[PDB]
From Swiss-Prot:
It comes from the Eukaryota. This is Translation initiation factor eIF2B subunit epsilon. It comes from Homo sapiens (Human). Residues 9-174 form the W2 domain. It is found in: Cytoplasm, Cytosol. Component of the translation initiation factor 2B (eIF2B) complex which is a heterodecamer of two sets of five different subunits: alpha, beta, gamma, delta and epsilon. Subunits alpha, beta and delta comprise a regulatory subcomplex and subunits epsilon and gamma comprise a catalytic subcomplex. Within the complex, the hexameric regulatory complex resides at the center, with the two heterodimeric catalytic subcomplexes bound on opposite sides. Transmembrane segments: none annotated. The chain holds residues 548 to 715 of 721 of the full protein. It is linked to Leukoencephalopathy with vanishing white matter 5: An autosomal recessive brain disease characterized by neurological features including progressive cerebellar ataxia, spasticity, and cognitive deficits. Brain imaging shows abnormal white matter that vanishes over time and is replaced by cerebrospinal fluid. Disease severity ranges from fatal infantile forms to adult forms without neurological deterioration. The disease is progressive with, in most individuals, additional episodes of rapid deterioration following febrile infections or minor head trauma. The lineage of its organism: Eukaryota, Metazoa, Chordata, Craniata, Vertebrata. Acts as a component of the translation initiation factor 2B (eIF2B) complex, which catalyzes the exchange of GDP for GTP on eukaryotic initiation factor 2 (eIF2) gamma subunit. Its guanine nucleotide exchange factor activity is repressed when bound to eIF2 complex phosphorylated on the alpha subunit, thereby limiting the amount of methionyl-initiator methionine tRNA available to the ribosome and consequently global translation is repressed. The gene is EIF2B5.
Length: 174
């Protein structure tokens, strides 16, 4: 109906504007503070929730490198492009991602991205390490997420490099 329809339309335009902001941010090296002012204004302009800001920021940054590479999608090439972006914009992530529930919202967006880009799955352990080392995500929420109830998501959690990382991550934490 009209409510879900108009809202899905809003989120789409909003996400397009978050892309435009980050394209400009990457070209200009716009400060994290000014990026946050832009995303905040768009969140009100497009009437999106604060949780939808976090999910959309996560998708847009994770999708950003795809503009920069051909297909078949090659994962080491992906990681090499992604990591400078996470370093640059980690403060933008930390402006919104603050409480345990927020950390799980972002993890679930990261899950959805990997599940939608099966050929990048291999690099998922290295990407979670970057979110962890950059203090975007807490080790304890990463563990919580890994251990959750909800097909393809259960099949992702039998990724080898990931299990290895989940065990490593249990060492630095406890």
């Amino acid at each position: 109906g009209h409510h879900h329809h108009h809202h899905m339309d809003d989120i789409k335009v909003f996400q397009n504007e978050v892309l435009g902001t980050l394209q400009r941010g990457k070209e200009e090296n716009i400060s994290c503070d000014n990026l946050v002012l832009e995303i905040n204004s768009l969140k009100y302009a497009y009437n999106i929730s604060l949780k939808e800001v976090m999910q959309v920021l996560s998708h847009v940054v994770l999708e950003f490198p795809l503009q920069q590479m051909d297909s078949p999608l090659d994962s080491s090439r992906y990681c090499a492009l992604l990591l400078p972006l996470l370093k640059a914009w980690s403060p933008v992530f930390r402006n919104y991602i603050k409480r345990a529930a927020d950390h799980l919202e972002a993890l679930a967006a990261i899950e959805d991205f990997f599940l939608e880009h099966e050929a990048l799955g291999i690099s998922m352990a290295k990407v979670l390490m970057a979110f962890y080392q950059l203090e975007i995500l807490a080790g304890e929420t990463i563990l919580s997420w890994f251990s959750q109830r909800d097909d393809k998501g259960q099949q992702l959690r039998k990724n080898q490099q990931l299990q290895r990382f989940i065990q490593w991550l249990k060492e630095a934490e406890e």
